[PDB]
Design a protein around this ligand. Structure first.
Ligand code: 1VI
Ligand code: BOG
Ligand code: BOG
Ligand code: BOG
Length: 326
């Protein structure tokens, strides 16, 4: 057990291993500080969870977040550098701290409402796709992918985050459809990509209905095959009452082709992440031997209704069993 020290930050007492120095608040689920990790030489973000075991819902959430972070081992997806508790036993366990690489720019910061060059767009979207292939292979769907959930460093390395607008959500998410396909996230990539190419938001809806109307105006009324998949006659009648190489003028035709395959209303006909990686638009970056898939992810916990003390114990087990990455 390393030796811990104490310090007052964000209105509570933080207690961290000595390896972590120069804590400085940076945001506030709880609270985040920047630090320097003297063991590794990395700038890190240390998150101290707020009220992790206050209720059944908080406890399950805490367990979910830890299980997710511990599973994610991939260059383009946020990973866990460390997890700790000052507690010496389960009975003493009340606090969880999570550590990852410090991130200081998201994709909005990278763009600044400027068209990126085509080569740049290829490299960014290639990385998002490469991440999404990995996440989707573990049977995980992000469901709210957007620029603020995409960290980019100074060498233009991108990571998918699950933290920091409805503009990039899939339309079926916006309709509380359920039964989501992993291609919900592909919708979102098409929205991001469009914006990188043009410098403008693709579907800047003012409200929920406005957004849906903008979407229908771009990609058109559902076709016959999609209309068969909607049981409600009223939904159909309403949709019909509401109803690329032109909108993306000047762009690389391979970018337009890809956009057309991602921004498809019918989720069952959207390109998958793995098929998108093999699209010609990415020939300069594509490597089929370096687009890894995840180990299987045991999500049996998600359907469980457990008591607080069991969610806390499971979490404690995951804290103890953590092995830092290479
Ligand atoms: C240092 O100078 C800056 C310049 C610009 C800037 O804006 C992006 C910021 C904000 C930096 C920031 O908040 N970085 C950060 C946050 C986190 C973070 N944020 C959240 S909100 C729920 N959670 C985490 C986090 C931290 C550790 C962990 F294991 C998991 C998630 C992770 C990594 N980096 C800082
Ligand atoms: C690091 C990027 C990975 C994507 C993180 C999102 C996957 C979250 O996982 C999910 O949390 C939701 C919250 O109630 C539930 O709706 C989903 O059932 C659960 O699966
Ligand atoms: C502007 C859009 C009008 C509303 C469109 C809602 C149509 C989708 O509604 C959905 O249809 C599915 C297929 O029948 C059902 O399984 C889903 O429960 C329902 O959410
Ligand atoms: C904007 C109003 C029309 C939106 C139509 C969205 C259609 C989304 O696509 C649908 O997604 C479901 C998974 O969620 C699948 O079960 C359906 O088979 C697929 O047709």
């Amino acid at each position: 057990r390393p030796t811990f020290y104490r310090q007052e930050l964000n209105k509570t007492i933080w207690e961290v291993p000595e390896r972590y120095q120069n804590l400085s608040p940076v945001g506030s689920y709880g609270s985040v500080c920047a630090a320097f990790d003297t063991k590794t030489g990395l700038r890190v973000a240390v998150k101290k969870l707020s009220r992790p075991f206050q209720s059944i819902i908080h406890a399950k959430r805490t367990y979910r977040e830890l299980r997710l972070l511990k599973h994610m081992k991939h260059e383009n997806v946020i990973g866990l550098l460390d997890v700790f508790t000052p507690a010496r036993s389960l009975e003493e366990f009340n606090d969880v701290y999570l550590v990852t690489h410090l991130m200081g720019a998201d994709l909005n910061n990278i763009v600044k409402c400027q068209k990126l060059t085509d080569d740049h767009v290829q490299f960014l979207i290639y990385q998002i796709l490469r991440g999404l292939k990995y996440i989707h292979s573990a049977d995980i769907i992000h469901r709210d992918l957007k620029p603020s959930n995409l960290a980019v460093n100074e060498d233009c390395e991108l990571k998918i985050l699950d933290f920091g607008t409805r503009w990039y959500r899939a339309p079926e998410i916006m309709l509380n459809w359920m039964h989501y396909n992993q291609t919900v996230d592909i919708w979102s990539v098409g929205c991001i990509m469009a914006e990188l190419l043009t410098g403008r938001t693709l579907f800047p809806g003012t409200d929920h209905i406005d957004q849906l109307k903008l979407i229908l105006r771009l990609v058109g009324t559902p076709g016959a095959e999609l209309l068969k998949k909607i049981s409600s006659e009223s939904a159909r009648n309403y949709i019909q009452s509401l109803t690329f190489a032109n909108v993306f003028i000047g762009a690389n035709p391979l970018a337009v082709d890809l956009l057309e395959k991602m921004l498809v209303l019918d989720s069952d006909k959207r390109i998958t992440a793995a098929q998108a990686l093999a699209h010609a638009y990415f020939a300069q970056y594509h490597d089929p031997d370096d687009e890894p898939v995840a180990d299987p992810y045991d999500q049996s916990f998600e359907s469980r209704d457990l008591l607080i003390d069991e969610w806390k114990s499971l979490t404690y087990d995951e804290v103890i069993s953590f092995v830092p990455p290479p």
